[PDB]
Enzyme design. Structure first.
Site, mmCIF file in Angstrom:
data_model
loop_
_atom_site.group_PDB
_atom_site.id
_atom_site.type_symbol
_atom_site.label_atom_id
_atom_site.label_comp_id
_atom_site.label_asym_id
_atom_site.label_seq_id
_atom_site.Cartn_x
_atom_site.Cartn_y
_atom_site.Cartn_z
ATOM 1 N N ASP A 23 46.942 50.306 47.638
ATOM 2 C CA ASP A 23 46.457 48.990 47.295
ATOM 3 C C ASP A 23 46.130 48.295 48.619
ATOM 4 O O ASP A 23 46.985 48.270 49.519
ATOM 5 C CB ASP A 23 47.488 48.165 46.508
ATOM 6 C CG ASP A 23 46.933 46.783 46.174
ATOM 7 O OD1 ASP A 23 45.843 46.690 45.554
ATOM 8 O OD2 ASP A 23 47.583 45.768 46.526
ATOM 9 N N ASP B 153 45.221 44.907 50.481
ATOM 10 C CA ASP B 153 45.269 43.459 50.333
ATOM 11 C C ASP B 153 44.845 42.845 51.687
ATOM 12 O O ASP B 153 45.641 42.356 52.505
ATOM 13 C CB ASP B 153 46.659 42.999 49.919
ATOM 14 C CG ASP B 153 46.811 41.496 49.768
ATOM 15 O OD1 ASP B 153 45.779 40.766 49.741
ATOM 16 O OD2 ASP B 153 47.993 41.070 49.750
ATOM 17 N N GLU C 4 43.232 40.041 53.560
ATOM 18 C CA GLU C 4 42.977 38.636 53.387
ATOM 19 C C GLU C 4 42.437 38.009 54.670
ATOM 20 O O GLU C 4 43.190 37.594 55.550
ATOM 21 C CB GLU C 4 44.319 37.935 52.999
ATOM 22 C CG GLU C 4 44.958 38.648 51.793
ATOM 23 C CD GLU C 4 46.057 37.909 51.064
ATOM 24 O OE1 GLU C 4 46.435 36.794 51.451
ATOM 25 O OE2 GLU C 4 46.564 38.409 50.025
ATOM 26 N N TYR D 24 44.867 32.672 41.594
ATOM 27 C CA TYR D 24 45.874 31.670 41.864
ATOM 28 C C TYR D 24 45.669 31.164 43.293
ATOM 29 O O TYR D 24 44.733 31.519 44.007
ATOM 30 C CB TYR D 24 47.296 32.170 41.633
ATOM 31 C CG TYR D 24 47.552 33.615 41.984
ATOM 32 C CD1 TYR D 24 47.544 34.050 43.312
ATOM 33 C CD2 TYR D 24 47.803 34.532 40.973
ATOM 34 C CE1 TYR D 24 47.776 35.383 43.616
ATOM 35 C CE2 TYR D 24 48.022 35.871 41.271
ATOM 36 C CZ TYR D 24 48.004 36.274 42.594
ATOM 37 O OH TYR D 24 48.257 37.598 42.879
#
Ligand SMILES: CC(=O)N[C@H]1[C@H](O[C@H]2[C@@H](O)[C@@H](NC(C)=O)[C@H](O[C@H]3[C@H](O)[C@H]4N=C(N(C)C)O[C@H]4[C@@H]3CO)O[C@@H]2CO)O[C@H](CO)[C@@H](O)[C@H]1O
Length: 540
Positions: free
Chosen positions: A288, A290, A292, A367
């Site tokens: 995965d 991630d 950012e 979110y």
């Protein structure tokens, strides 16, 4: 006459294919993958003829044989498959073979083949669901939650997930490479100790203690090779063979290294380290990412380039090729996912319509739309839709889905995000028509672990009584609690807003739901994720 019956000598019976050095703090020294476990067995013969050949059998099959030359002997041999074996020493001569009683020997491996299934009772409000909708139900577990938060892998309601992700695997690198970690006291340093002697841009383990050595339910014996979160995850995989357990690389504070990966030298070193990590830790089912975020605007203000989009698509294609290769080597299916910004400004810095062909799932982080990082412009942090007072609201779940869909992403790729935490403000003031979101704030709400952020468990436990107002905004599909006398305002997901996301997923043929983070729920959020996607109550 056949020989006497040998007695297995007392001795170590626990052995490991992947050895763990108990006095190491650097990842390179901590783990040693071998092709086979070194096993040793000794025996004595207390009565009788010692035979002319001695053999060690595992489940009846010879693992070693040698001349029997007197009343005791030792054998050293290799076992290349993890599991528990009934080991016997037999002494043979021309008149027959005589086998000892059986002694079990444990050969550990990181698929958890030596462990008993970790199959624990559901806790708090979690109720049992079958995974039979065919939709993704995911959540992230965090390596650092095992200390003061006290939330360990045996507390995950693991039958209620399709996907369990582990945050976070760090990428090695010191000054200039992981400077965002320097905001967490001790954290940057910790990574440098873990990565001593290890090249930058290779993955490692950020807290080796929590990941592999802290005593945990089911992995408490001193000579259990894999303890901590990873030993528990291995045993969880024995209990739930179809659970996908994925390592997540990056997050807010460990994404800086991705910004250097337009250098293909570094990118290839990264991807090869991921390959090696998955060959080492065989309970994991893929990776995965991630990052950012491509284009910047993550933790570090000095990072982000126009080139990031291309690098993200290259990274995914090459990760896929490495997993495709690992998959045929092993016969296993491996998954490649990513957690991405849901803001349309960030989405469009990547061509997800291309990158989707390499990816199994896109975890849309619908979110953090609003929060204590902006004290002037308040709103729902995880709403499905815009609220009635601001129908032009940019950051909503539907807007992030729609931006993906408009690029040409297939709906089935897109996994919608639910928050198991609220964000909030204190001192909210100057708002109209009793809607506190039209006001402005004086600072962050007091959080559970850190400022501005509150576990859902504590929202439900402490902030839904006394003076707290509760409102469900049915236009946005978002709950919020407000304490008028301090002006504390907290924006969260609850069972109903999650149900609204799940129906929406089903109506729009999206891929499912995932949450951050699993220690913060009391059961209500993951219960509603499951029910809203149409999973049946009960157990299979
Ligand atoms: C590794 C590290 O820096 N740990 C810090 C820890 O930082 C956490 C928290 O700040 C998380 N905040 C919340 C709301 O829980 C933050 O969560 C981010 C995560 O990075 C992003 N990735 C995704 N995924 C779906 C993959 O979701 C977002 C979430 C939610 O916005 O993660 C950082 C680490 O990146 O903070 C504690 C203090 O609370 C500190 O002690 C240390 O453990």
């Amino acid at each position: 006459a056949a020989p006497g019956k040998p007695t297995i000598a007392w001795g170590n019976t626990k052995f490991a294919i992947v050895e763990v050095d108990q006095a190491a703090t650097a990842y390179n020294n901590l783990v040693k993958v071998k092709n086979a476990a070194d096993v040793s067995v000794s025996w004595n013969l207390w009565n009788g003829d010692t035979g002319t050949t001695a053999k060690v059998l595992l489940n009846g099959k010879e693992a070693w044989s040698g001349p029997s030359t007197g009343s005791s002997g030792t054998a050293n041999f290799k076992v290349n498959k993890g599991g528990r074996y009934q080991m016997q020493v037999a002494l043979c001569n021309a008149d027959g073979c005589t086998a000892s009683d059986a002694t079990e020997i444990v050969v550990a491996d990181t698929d958890g083949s030596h462990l008993a299934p970790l199959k624990e009772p559901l806790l708090e409000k979690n109720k049992p669901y079958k995974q039979n909708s065919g939709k993704v139900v995911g959540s992230y577990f965090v390596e650092w939650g095992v200390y003061g938060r006290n939330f360990t892998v045996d507390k995950i309601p693991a039958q209620n997930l399709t996907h369990l992700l582990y945050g976070f695997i760090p990428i090695c690198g010191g000054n200039g490479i992981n400077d965002s970690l320097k905001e967490i006291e001790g954290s940057f340093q910790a990574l440098q100790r873990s990565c001593q002697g290890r090249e930058d841009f290779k993955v490692s383990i950020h807290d080796p203690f929590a990941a592999l050595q802290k005593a945990q339910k089911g992995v408490t014996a001193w000579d259990d090779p894999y303890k901590g979160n990873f030993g528990q995850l291995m045993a969880l995989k024995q209990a739930h063979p179809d659970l996908k357990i994925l390592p997540s690389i990056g997050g807010w504070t460990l994404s800086d290294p991705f910004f250097f990966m337009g250098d293909k030298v570094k990118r290839d070193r990264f991807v090869g380290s991921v390959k090696e990590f998955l060959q080492t830790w065989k309970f994991f089912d893929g990776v995965d990412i991630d990052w950012e975020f491509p284009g910047g605007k993550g933790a570090n203000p000095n990072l982000g380039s126009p080139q990031d989009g291309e690098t993200y698509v290259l990274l995914m294609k090459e990760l896929r090729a490495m997993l495709d290769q690992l998959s045929v080597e092993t016969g296993r299916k491996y998954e490649l996912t990513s957690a991405i910004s849901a803001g349309k400004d960030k989405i469009d810095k990547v061509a997800y319509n291309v990158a989707q062909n390499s990816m199994d799932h896109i975890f849309l982080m619908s979110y953090d739309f609003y929060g204590a990082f902006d004290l002037k412009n308040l709103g729902h942090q995880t709403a499905l839709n815009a609220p009635a007072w601001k129908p032009d609201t940019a950051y909503t779940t539907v807007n992030g889905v729609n931006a993906l869909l408009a690029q040409g992403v297939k709906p089935g790729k897109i996994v919608v995000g639910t928050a198991m935490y609220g964000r909030g403000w204190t001192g909210v003031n100057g708002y109209q028509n009793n809607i506190p979101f039209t006001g402005t704030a004086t600072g962050p709400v007091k959080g559970t672990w850190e400022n501005g952020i509150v576990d859902y468990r504590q929202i439900a436990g402490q902030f839904m009584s006394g003076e707290w107002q509760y409102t469900y905004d049915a236009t946005a599909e978002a709950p919020y609690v407000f304490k008028p006398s301090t002006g504390d305002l907290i924006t969260f997901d609850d069972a109903r807003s999650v149900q609204a996301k799940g129906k929406y997923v089903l109506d729009k043929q999206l891929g499912g739901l995932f949450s951050w983070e699993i220690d913060a729920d009391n059961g209500d959020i993951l219960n509603s994720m499951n029910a809203s996607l149409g999973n049946s109550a009960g157990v299979q």
